[model samples]
Target: INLNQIYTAKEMSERIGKNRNYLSQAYRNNKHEILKNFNYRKIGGTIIFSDNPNNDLSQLITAKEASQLLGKNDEYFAHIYKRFPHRLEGIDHIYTGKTLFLTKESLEVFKK
Candidate 1:
């Protein structure tokens, strides 16, 4: 995706395991600001969000640790990143100075 895709909370709620009713009630009560923190907007009683890979998955961790949880080799993420930078980039990995890091939330979304 161009990272420019927009989506309603339905997909996001499932992705992040948020309660749909809670989010629905929050937005229903003119509480769009609650979702604004997630970079969202309302359009004719409909709420949508910008595709923010980093914003949605902000808790970063080392590739080693992230890979360990997946039971993959420590070098697996880097190997894939090197081959397909487009898939990872700011989506699952980021460069902090010279060291590349991955986010905990990345593991789940990256599955697709």
Candidate 2:
């Protein structure tokens, strides 16, 4: 891990293979959740990251984002989860029965 290197929000978001607005909104609304998974800093108005090996890049997306990535509707993904449970992993939302998705990884497997 390059502990000395700093990255912009766009770079970090791209590195993690996530949407820029998604990450930004998470930081604004659910900061505690993001901090649990990443080591970040706020420098002026810019958000930066440190060289922490534990700064996990693994992130999950909603059904809408997953559907966009898969070129299908959110309902399709929901049905997919029902048909092939092994192809995708679901992170159950605490308050709701809905599941979050890790789209890029799953889509690669789903396509193959």
Candidate 3:
């Protein structure tokens, strides 16, 4: 039903299209956020996440950034996102505990 594999920090970032620390530093600051949404595990110091059945952390920008791309406000993006969750499936419009970021390449379509 879900991925049981795990990858290294470099591989994960490369696979997910985030920079180096998206999984590394995020683990310290946004532990619960990722641990819940990802298929990951700890192995002493280094660890990993994979093709989770739930949410994917691949390729993201801030929600506000996605809003600005359309010459709209954060609330504007939020309205569409909340009302049409089906539009942005796995990777788009993902949220952290106190922050929400966007998968720009996928979400930018809304601008036009």
Candidate 4:
């Protein structure tokens, strides 16, 4: 499945294991930022979420760890995905199905 595809609030709720009401509330509360952050939009009265694979998942690292690993800040590693996206192995999600990161293995390979 193309993670970049657009889907409904309901579909996304299911995908991320969040209830529609809870997800909708956050969207309602921070509509502007969330819209821009996630690149989401509304169709009629229905809200849709567009996948942002960059924001969707990238392994998080502290500045110290990142520097030790790649001689750069974590943000640098994060941006590298934009330039070499094919290097990503996968996004790591938590139990709630929230997409979180690049695998450590990928980061190691990226150093090479």
Candidate 5:
């Protein structure tokens, strides 16, 4: 059951009531200290993440920018994402489409 959604650092920060830079630092430090967690996907050098089965995804963000939120580099997340392969669901067929960039929700599903 996936929401097929994503979010950006600026958007995510607003939802959690935090500054963009603060969230960026948390991801860069691998603190995993988020109260809410989500999954992530990388496409065209963009990072995308999601929340519940209702929220939506944000636009594309650089790997470096997303890395700050993940507290790791693109390679680190690539490994973890290989298993999850987070992506949008209702775009076309069951799962057929180009890879999308990463979003703020990339690491938001692990919470709770």
Candidate 6:
């Protein structure tokens, strides 16, 4: 239930059969649809989901979303920030202090 324990677009797609481009688009535009069908818990800037509440579905990405992104489930996306904690010490993806981020442009590399 901790968003901090959630994966990035790269990671989720690898596990959920989703293409990077589609996942990015979904997270960018179709998030409402994603949330509508999935049982997700959002915290801070992270999103986590689970079919079994008793299970720890924290770091696990859905196989459906991943397979769609990477062509195959050969790999999964993991956060580089974990190894470099200092890089994201106090940053929030939604608000970067300068302005309110509307799309991936201000929030992710694809947007710009």
Candidate with the greatest TM-score versus the true structure: 1
Ranking by lDDT: 1, 3, 2, 4, 5, 6
Q: Which residue runs of candidate 5 sit more than 4 Å off their true CA positions?
A: 1-4, 41-44, 53-112
Taking all chains together, each candidate's TM-score versus the true structure is: 0.42, 0.39, 0.40, 0.35, 0.36, 0.31
- What digit string (tens of lDDT, one per residue) describes model 4 on residues 1-112? 2334545676676667777664577677975554455544443345656465543232333223443566676556445455765545453211112222333544565556
What's model 1's lDDT at 20? 62
**Two-way TM-score contest, 2 vs 6, winner:** 2
TM-score of 1: 0.42
lDDT of 4: 0.48
Best by lDDT: 1
**Model 1 stretches with alpha carbons more than 4 Å out:** 1-58
Q: Tens digit of lDDT per residue, candidate 2, span 1-112?
A: 2323445566667668888665567777877767567666553345655446553323334455666776788666666667876555433211011343343454565566
RMSD of each: 12.8, 11.8, 11.2, 11.6, 12.6, 14.9
Query: Which residue segments of model 3 deviate by more than 4 Å?
Result: 1-59
Between prediction 1 and prediction 6, which has the larger TM-score? 1
Give one digit per residue, the lDDT tens place, for model 5 in 1-112: 2433445444555556777655555556765756236444343433334555343433344434554675776555444445654432222111112332343443453221
The candidate with the higher TM-score, 1 or 3, is: 1
Error of 3 at 24 (Å): 12
Local accuracy by lDDT, each model: 0.58, 0.53, 0.57, 0.48, 0.44, 0.39
Candidate 2 positional error at 38, Å: 0.9
